[PDB]
Symmetry: D2
Subunit: 419 residues, 4 copies
Amino acid sequence: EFRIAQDVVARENDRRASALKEDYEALGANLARRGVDIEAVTAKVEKFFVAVPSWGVGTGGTRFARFPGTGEPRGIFDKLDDCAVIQQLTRATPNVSLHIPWDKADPKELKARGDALGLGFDAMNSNTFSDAPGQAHSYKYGSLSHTNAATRAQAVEHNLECIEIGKAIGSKALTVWIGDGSNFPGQSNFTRAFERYLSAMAEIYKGLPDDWKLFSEHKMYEPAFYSTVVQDWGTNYLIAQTLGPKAQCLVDLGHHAPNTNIEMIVARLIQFGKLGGFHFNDSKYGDDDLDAGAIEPYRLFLVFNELVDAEARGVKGFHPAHMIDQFHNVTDPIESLINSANEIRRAYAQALLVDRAALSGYQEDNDALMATETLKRAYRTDVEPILAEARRRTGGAVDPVATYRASGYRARVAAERPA
Amino acid sequence: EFRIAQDVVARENDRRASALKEDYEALGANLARRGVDIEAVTAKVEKFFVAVPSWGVGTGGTRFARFPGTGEPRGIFDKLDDCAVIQQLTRATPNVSLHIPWDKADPKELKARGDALGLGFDAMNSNTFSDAPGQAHSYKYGSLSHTNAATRAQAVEHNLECIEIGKAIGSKALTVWIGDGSNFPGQSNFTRAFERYLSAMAEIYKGLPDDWKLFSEHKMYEPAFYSTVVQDWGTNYLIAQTLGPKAQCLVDLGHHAPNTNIEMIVARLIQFGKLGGFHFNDSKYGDDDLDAGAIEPYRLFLVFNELVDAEARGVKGFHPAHMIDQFHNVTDPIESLINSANEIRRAYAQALLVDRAALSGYQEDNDALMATETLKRAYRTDVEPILAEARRRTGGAVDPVATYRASGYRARVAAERPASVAGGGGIIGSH
Amino acid sequence: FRIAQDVVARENDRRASALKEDYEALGANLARRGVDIEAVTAKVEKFFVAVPSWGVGTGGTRFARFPGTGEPRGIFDKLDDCAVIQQLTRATPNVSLHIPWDKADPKELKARGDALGLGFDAMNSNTFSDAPGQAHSYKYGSLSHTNAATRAQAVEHNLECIEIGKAIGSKALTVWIGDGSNFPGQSNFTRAFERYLSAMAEIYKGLPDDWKLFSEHKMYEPAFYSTVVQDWGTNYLIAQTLGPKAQCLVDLGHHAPNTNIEMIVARLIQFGKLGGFHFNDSKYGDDDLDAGAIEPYRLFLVFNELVDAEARGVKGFHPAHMIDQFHNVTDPIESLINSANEIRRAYAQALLVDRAALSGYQEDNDALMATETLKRAYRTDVEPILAEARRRTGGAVDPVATYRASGYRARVAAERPASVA
Amino acid sequence: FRIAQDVVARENDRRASALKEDYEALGANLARRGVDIEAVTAKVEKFFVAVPSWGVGTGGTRFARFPGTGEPRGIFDKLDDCAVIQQLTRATPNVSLHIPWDKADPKELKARGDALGLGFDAMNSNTFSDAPGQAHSYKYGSLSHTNAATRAQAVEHNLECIEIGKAIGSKALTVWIGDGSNFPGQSNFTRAFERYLSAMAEIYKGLPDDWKLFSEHKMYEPAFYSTVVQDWGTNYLIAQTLGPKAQCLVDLGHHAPNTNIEMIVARLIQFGKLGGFHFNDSKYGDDDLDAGAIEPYRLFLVFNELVDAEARGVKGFHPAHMIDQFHNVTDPIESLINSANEIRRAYAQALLVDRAALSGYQEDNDALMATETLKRAYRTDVEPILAEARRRTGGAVDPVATYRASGYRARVAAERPASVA
Ligand SMILES: O=C[C@H](O)[C@H](O)[C@H](O)[C@H](O)CO
Ligand SMILES: O=C[C@H](O)[C@H](O)[C@H](O)[C@H](O)CO
Ligand SMILES: O=C[C@H](O)[C@H](O)[C@H](O)[C@H](O)CO
Ligand SMILES: O=C[C@H](O)[C@H](O)[C@H](O)[C@H](O)CO
Ligand SMILES: [Mn+2]
Ligand SMILES: [Mn+2]
Ligand SMILES: [Mn+2]
Ligand SMILES: [Mn+2]
Ligand SMILES: [Mn+2]
Ligand SMILES: [Mn+2]
Ligand SMILES: [Mn+2]
Ligand SMILES: [Mn+2]
């Protein structure tokens, strides 16, 4: 089934086909003069996938308010239908990230809907940073690191349930992000809290299938405003190293202190084999969870530069998980996810254009200016024609958001769904 | 009316009177050696008041979750009852700050309950950063600076209603904090948005009584994550100067960029006569809204140092409004407000101990070390005995939280009020 | 000609074919977008930014300085080097002087400038360091020092800078001082600012009718607790207090972490106090790195506000543009060349913004399309436009490549003695 | 004695009565709290922190250095001044040397230290600046430089520092380098770190059985884009990789804005890699201001983690303590005196925390009482304990007052020639 009528996709592609041909051929000639085969780049770009978050499909909110738009998804099934639109038009988001209990539903039904829509499932996400109705023990003062044994046990069991749901739908990983921490000096004993966390995570690790990975996600602050148990990549590395080979670190771009060199953290984790994956988004102040690349596109490119360099250095067994983790408070969630996925492919494509041999030479000779200009020559390249052609060749739309709007999809679901 | 049994207050005071007498006399002797009359300090401290936020007595939350405790107040009336406890025990929070529509209710009843509890009302707070039921125009894309004229008009009318409510209960000011801004480059035209804001505030200004003040509150970010119309004190100054004499700037401690020298902003606003008031709280990362002085007590003292210096060089008319703006997510709201008000008086008392003449000399002589040590000599002084004696002498508790717990108030209201339920913070819609 | 014309010609010819292909391709793409590439190029070739005399020599940090070869022996050598930057980029016809670093006979400075085809931008005073023979030290301040005689001395220095500027063609004085405190209590914030305002008022009295006085704010460094002119708010208060000739200068790296700098630019323009800019890039503090080398989009967003001002018809808006950078690990000339290029790049992209479309998206609160409208311009590779602008004005298609081909650095290395003490 | 004993005696007697009153009052208050003031004073008397040789001279920024009178020139003058700090505070018996700044015949250094009653803490290498005659420049790095010969030179320098330390009684080497990049792409993050680790392994091989090797992380400066040893995470990787003798040194001002530094301390302790501390205070960057002059509570919270670690009986816990500050606008000796005092103040307050009560409030999630339990200790004015500790051990009740009364500064000013009168 197609959420967007194929005739609309075809019409909107034909409408822009002439211009795309001109732009693609021009870029192809330019890249040829630079010793690059545009076809090789396009081939790789159409193979780059990033998971879409179920929680990014509906309108998000801040601690002050939430302003829903029309046709808001009523539950996970509406969310999957909307995710199908993003994948159909961008062809870059074949998999969806589920969050439990937000997306709790019959696993078999979720799988059935996914297969029918042509969607798979990425890492499962547990939730012990909020209480559900009728919950025995509250996570107000923590979960996996709570001082109360029964509360930690409940948190561990919840994570095990997430694994069971994931096994039924085809997921192969569990991502653990908790709000555990303190808001006041002295409230928590830093070391004892971390010890409790490690012990609880060891229980989750024990119940982790051998064909699964366990990702821990660090965050400097929020909801905890003084200290956070898994506060940065250093603590995260200690966690992954302690737990075992199936445990790795997940880097969410907006979870770092002001001015942090995030691409270096990425490089360090790769060198020590603990880069499990990414949570892409952009930010300017805190964990803003904005559309990827909308604020600092160069930083996104620099992160991908490290990923491509890893392949160039010959790093083996490196297949980091890629996922978008964003909240859309003032835009149509589907449109934001579409352009965010596009931006991630944009940064990747540009990273593929870097002349690695030239860069290596400038690095060895300490020619800082030419080294940085070598990266800029790739980053400054407008790869939109490659992204558009990749989409066109794989069943997507030349201009995804334009096609989405032309389809009238939002108005359609607005009529099918309550206000 | 006394929310806390007088016999309990008396009992818990007597239990700690002996120790307090010893500490107070010891501190008195120490201050005497330093040429300071402890009685003069205590007299000033017992007269220092800070407004308590009605939204502070209810458990707060983040965008991820809210974890209510027992005996959560149902509405403004329950909140007033709880605020009465803070005032009774600390004697430092006689006035309450209301937020509309959260606390909307019959002005006559609000005023009636306040008088019965011995509580007054500080500045009113308007709310155009969220949508209420039946609202004609959404504030999703802004309010006072929204591109849509009808939306700005609705926001203006709401603020005027806040003034009308305040006039009936004894309030003398309106604080305006909005979330207006953008999450993406290009979404808003910075200049046009600010022009719209200024025009809307001018309409609100026209509705201000002669003895009223209009306080605009700046904030770097949140809910807007790229730009905010009233983003810092610079824009705030432009607003206040543009609007008129009754318009001033409100400084919320947790609303500034990392590493900002906040006490300097305070001094600058005082110098140009635009320091409307404060929203006290503490923080480490963003607008954390934590208990005042719980993270950076020296910074709080340094802010008070600027205020007391002004109070010293006689900046007449200068009467900034002091208010606590905090959210309590992991403590009993009443206890946190009690200790926060205490910490504010602590910083004030220490600022009063500064040898101004000595400091001035070291400043003129560029003796940086002795100048800083002159501030430290005041700040290092443990003024707790003064704070406790001030409370005891005015009908309060030597140890407020201790007396609060001994009274069993929380368990009391917990049995009178309906049970609460924990949930999310609205990060996503129902599912 | 600092750089042999035959070298510039040879290197331009070597790259002519590719430039033609790229420029024509971009022109067709822009035409499809309703933009005339020729109109953009014509404006870009007229965008100028002042080159700092202090940026031509290798810079350093408080830990160390690592000079390269052929370091300039003073202002005359510095002007010669600035001439290279202008000849190759054609985007830096004016030089920013700093006194007393560049103190010399005004007549000689003017003669060298004219001979090289260079003019002079705003003068920069220096009361953040002590020069020989000073009766008073600036250790504890200058224009805001507690000692009246010290303030008077700093005022006289600034007036001297104005005299030098008048003689060479300058029309403005930029004042940046380190005045502040390193400890709470050391300074009375208000009295220190009042002293500063009194001293600046005196300097203001010495301004010719057609001169401007620019005050430059900075959050910290050299002062590590408080700084008198710490941010744009205090800066606005200064400009408004002094008069119409006084405006604020915004140095990109002088703001608190995460500050929305482009908004500050918009605010100052709205109130007629945006005197000018000090361009550079940074990641941590006032790093003074090559413009756009760290955050190119931010640079574009600043230019977006500048171009919007013109779009809104702001009257009498002629902000000064200057590069303020230090080059610690690169050939200073090469870094200034590429920095000037990046500045023109961001400017060119700002010119490409479809503001008619943007205005509509802003009115309808279509945040996604509004931001995509800016991105469509920013994502455009305008290098062909910058290169063609250089070709037509006597510059080099690839400035740094031509610079290296000329062997200039090796040449001056043999002519200039390296300091030995 | 640098300071005449009669002066120390006179200035102590002048303040003896007030100290007695305050000490007895605090003793009674602590008694009511179940604490023996005598036990606290005994512990405070034994808490030592190393004084930096580079701290007694006036510091500066990249903009300027404003020396005071009697500036110590050379390590011998510096040791004489360090002796004053130890005599008056009795809290700084050991000095931290920096090579080559303090290079001198080891026998003479040792002899001078012994004569002044001073020992030597960890040695500090310098490959972040170039020395005269140096074969390879550190402009682009040292231990992680791309050039093998440059890395070898850096390694040899560090080995030389170990040799000097062995001769004077030092038992550790602290390695802080500026290695990094100012531009994206300039360095390959991974390869640079691999080179650093290989170089450090060579240095590790030259460590005596009873020596420690401390690596010091820093977010930025001198490198403004990336730094090889940028944070505690990389630092942990270094220490774990090198071996049991390698640990991490935490300099308070070397972290990103808002970082929870006390947590980093706890984490390193838990994994046995907390080598030591570089105490100072800051507000913006690596300001290197007097300890506790900006954020005294943070300093106390760091000490709370140290005292807790000992209370828990953690193994491998025995950190070195050193002051790493620069004094740009004060008498260096006075600042070091009061900074050492502030460090002992924070330590003393940490000793007052009721650990049993705190543990209970933590287990029961009583956040308010847990934080108040820390505040009860922090709010306690321990000055009487610090003063009594000094008085009982040969120091001064009020160190700075005694220092000024002695006229020491004027004395060395008369013995040491300044650049200009
Ligand atoms: O801040 C929360 C983290 O980004 C987590 O990944 C979280 O589970 C996700 O954002 C959903 O709220
Ligand atoms: O961030 C919001 C500001 O602090 C306002 O004062 C607000 O109205 C208050 O915090 C209640 O949410
Ligand atoms: O930080 C100093 C400012 O950028 C000034 O413009 C200064 O005069 C210039 O950088 C030269 O040092
Ligand atoms: O920033 C430099 C580090 O703090 C090092 O410890 C350094 O060796 C010391 O500060 C002396 O410069
Ligand atoms: Mn995430
Ligand atoms: Mn997040
Ligand atoms: Mn507030
Ligand atoms: Mn707030
Ligand atoms: Mn500048
Ligand atoms: Mn600067
Ligand atoms: Mn250090
Ligand atoms: Mn340092």
